[PDB]
Symmetry: C3
Subunit: 257 residues, 3 copies
């Protein structure tokens, strides 16, 4: 059948139609797996965890584990994963902490590559790519279409804006605004993901307004308040520029410069 007899399914666990579990996989108590989701061999799922439809989870992944501690501490804490996600070999995903959200949240159509770490209370949106060995410390918010290149380290509470790009080996300590490309340890803003805008079919008017929006924030010596005021008009014409202005507005503890 679809359920390999060498897998251990806890009596409390809930499996929907067309679910596959490979051999020697543990689907622990309070884990719920959605329609057509494929669990490979040698996977550990721990709950309380909700996984949606048409997901693929590869061998050696630990999905819904507790955040590391010298002692067991703080539950019920949730992990929620949406639909059409690919979680590759040996990925670690921790559930939330009772102190903060009490939930780690992953949306839809995300690709999390081998040995990536998703820390407690982190929130991933849709259509994101975390390349090999990307580590989100915890309480990290990754917005839609963001790409973290291989071995990107993100500090606790940092926001990764929509359509942003972090070069491989980047260590991020401050918010990355929407569309911004960052590199190095510590991470420095370089340009914008113009490549990614074109692959999203952004009007060349929107891309040119986003180029000027970069220069307003990074290049003209403005305060953030002065920048937000200078962007207000562009943000009103282009929803794309508003995503950018909003990412800067939301950064209380400062942006990656």
């Amino acid at each position: 059948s679809l359920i390999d007899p060498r897998a251990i399914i806890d009596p409390s666990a809930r499996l929907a139609a067309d679910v596959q579990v490979g051999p020697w996989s543990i689907v622990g108590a309070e884990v719920e797996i959605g329609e057509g989701t494929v669990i490979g061999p040698h996977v550990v799922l721990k709950g309380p965890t909700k996984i949606g439809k048409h997901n693929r989870i590869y061998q050696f992944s630990s999905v819904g584990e507790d955040t590391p501690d010298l002692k067991y501490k703080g539950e019920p804490t949730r992990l929620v994963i949406g639909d059409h996600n690919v979680i590759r070999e040996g990925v670690t995903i921790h559930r939330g902490t009772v102190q903060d959200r009490a939930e780690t949240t992953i949306g839809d159509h995300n690709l999390i590559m081998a040995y990536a770490h998703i820390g407690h209370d982190s929130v991933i949106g849709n259509h994101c790519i975390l390349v090999n060995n990307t580590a989100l410390a915890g309480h990290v918010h990754v917005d839609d279409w963001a790409i973290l290149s291989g071995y990107t380290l993100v500090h606790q509470y940092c926001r990764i804006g929509a359509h942003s790009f972090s070069g491989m080996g980047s260590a991020i300590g401050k918010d990355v605004p929407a569309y911004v490309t960052v590199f190095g340890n510590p991470a420095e803003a370089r340009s914008m993901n113009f490549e990614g805008m074109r692959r999203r079919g952004f009007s060349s008017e929107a891309i040119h307004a986003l180029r000027r929006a970069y220069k307003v924030v990074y290049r003209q010596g403005h305060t953030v308040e002065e920048a937000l005021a200078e962007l207000a008009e562009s943000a009103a014409q282009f929803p794309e520029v508003a995503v950018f202005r909003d990412s800067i507005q939301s950064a209380t503890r400062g942006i990656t410069r």
Copy 2:
């Protein structure tokens, strides 16, 4: 307690309270002490001693041979203390004869996902190795040391008591006790003042250490000039002696 789908070698030695998850291998000459929980999918190889009330998580390879070419199959050891947590996919290699033929881990150590503890490494107590920390080999980590995620330590380096390394740090030279280091290559920034307050250090002892840092790092002295300047502060404050002693035992230089 011992899951029937685990392979326990005849010559393994497990206390009554020990839990072994399914699909785990307790290899030849593996001692495991009372209260220790071995998760599923764990490979333990010997000769290895594991103390008490330890927790080893799935996909961990504890007590394998180093691939370091200078190792040639000698019966070298791995000792682990008590109340240690070893997380998902941690690799801990046994020692080599060229040193002391032992990798040593003490008590109350938190070793997070995919950390590497190379051959002959000595970790003390209440240490934190965050995800993907790599100790290349012969690395001595002293009590209360914290190495942040993806911290790389070159062979033979000493990580001082209460020292802290920023994430993605690459350490080539000894880190003195209490010192904070960041970047590739690693550079001294300040003292672990949080760590001192964690331990309940006197505001005297913290002020003495704040000064001691300036003597070594900020006053354009040499190491020899600096050691002599500290010797009185060191004699008065056992806390300052830990710092001064870590600089003296640094024969291959300190992280500046």
Copy 3:
């Protein structure tokens, strides 16, 4: 017997007579293992894949999985491993893509340490060392005797020259010429692997010629074509200098400086 009864051997799998396979290992369809090869417990082998003779593959390794790269669409691509290779704990090796030569290729006597990654369409030669957590993004050519120390990151299409050395935590966006020593993120050219050359028994005359060849490429203000021209004489005299000159000539992303 040598195949553990808890192992899963696909009917279509071809194992030489003395092949060992540890418990809860998977030898999938169209996987060939040559004589002497030992597979440890908890190993996943997917095909189409050819593993040669006297190889050792450690636990938690995923050898021959599909690349998550979005351009691969389930085409029947290959992985080929030669003889006398050691693959340590948790290594990932993906098969090729039809956009290149539909093959990922490893030669002989290579040491690939724990959690190292070998991306689609990568070509490793002989006597290479990939230290812990080294990652080749894809289409990476590593020539014979190349050392990549721990957590070395290699961008797609980068060529790592013969007897080259990359320091711990290096991030390589451009070709590493043969013999050259690189460090840092981004990677920086800092002289040549003279201790490597003296160890493998290179002549004093050859080492002295490589020393001058280095000055011509890096220290004489020459553009690459001006340099390739000046090396032409010395490359005709010494094979080592030809390998060096050849590595520079075949740089598609430029060279590490």
